[PDB]
Amino acid sequence: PMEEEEVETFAFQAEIAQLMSLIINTFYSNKEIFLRELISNSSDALDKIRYESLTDPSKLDSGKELHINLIPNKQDRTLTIVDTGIGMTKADLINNLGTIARSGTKAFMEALQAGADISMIGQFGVGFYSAYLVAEKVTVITKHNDDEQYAWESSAGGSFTVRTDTGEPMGRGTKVILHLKEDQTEYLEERRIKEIVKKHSQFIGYPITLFVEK
Numbered sequence: 001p002m003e004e005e006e007v008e009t010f011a012f013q014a015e016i017a018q019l020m021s022l023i024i025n026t027f028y029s030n031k032e033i034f035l036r037e038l039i040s041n042s043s044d045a046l047d048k049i050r051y052e053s054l055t056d057p058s059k060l061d062s063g064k065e066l067h068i069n070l071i072p073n074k075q076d077r078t079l080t081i082v083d084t085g086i087g088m089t090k091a092d093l094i095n096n097l098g099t100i101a102r103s104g105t106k107a108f109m110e111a112l113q114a115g116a117d118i119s120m121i122g123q124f125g126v127g128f129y130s131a132y133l134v135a136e137k138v139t140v141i142t143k144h145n146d147d148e149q150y151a152w153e154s155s156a157g158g159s160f161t162v163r164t165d166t167g168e169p170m171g172r173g174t175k176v177i178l179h180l181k182e183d184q185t186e187y188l189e190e191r192r193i194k195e196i197v198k199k200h201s202q203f204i205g206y207p208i209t210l211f212v213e214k
């Protein structure tokens with residue numbers, strides 16, 4: 001029986017779209033910090049579970065472990081960052097991942113224009129968009145306790161879509177799927193992934209596991 005998925009399309013806020021264009025079309029040293037930004041986002045999302053739970057018991061009754069899995073797929077040329085954090089409602093995806101201005105965007109674009117390290121992106125409140133250093137398309141599957149499962153997707157170019165995501169239930173949390181650019185396949189290598197997690201992500205307070213395809 002055929003599923004129906006409602007799809008809505010949204011313009012990125014003016015400066016976020018400009019930032020994405022800058023990120024996409026400019027060479028940066030130190031691209032590898034994208035992974036640090038996504039793991040940090042997962043970590044924040046798991047912190048929120050813990051604070052809902054240390055503070056609102058029904059959350060306590062989940063049996064899911066709080067964790068981050070990294071899943072490179074060399075066949076599909078994707079890298080997926082999965083967490084069991086609080087997830088995002090539909091409103092959350094639309095508001096938080098592209099329609100609302102961030103006060104740091106302009107200053108961050110000026111800093112990059114003046115040759116700052118892309119690694120500074122975490123301090124300007126726009127760290128998610130580092131995904132576009134290495135990915136030509138990003139899909140975010142998400143499931144929050146208060147909503148249905150949603151998929152957000154953008155190949156940049158000024159808009160993104162949010163749609164209900166039916167079947168493949170993922171349970172609470174978020175999966176960010178990076179469809180890597182043809183020249184960024186080094187981020188599918190177990191040794192590369194381990195290197196960058198050790199160098200940039202060693203104070204995450206949750207277990208992170210890397211799934212290596214035999």
Ligand SMILES: Nc1ncnc2c1ncn2[C@@H]1O[C@H](COP(=O)(O)OP(N)(=O)O)[C@@H](O)[C@H]1O
Nearest residue numbers: 041042045085087088096125126127128129174
């Ligand atoms: N893995 C994730 N789980 C839940 N929400 C996530 C997420 N990754 C990103 N987000 C949402 O996207 C927002 C933007 O993230 P980012 O560009 O890194 O800025 P920041 N300082 O809030 O971490 C986050 O504040 C959060 O609301």
Ligand SMILES: [Mg+2]
Nearest residue numbers: 040041127128
């Ligand atoms: Mg962040």
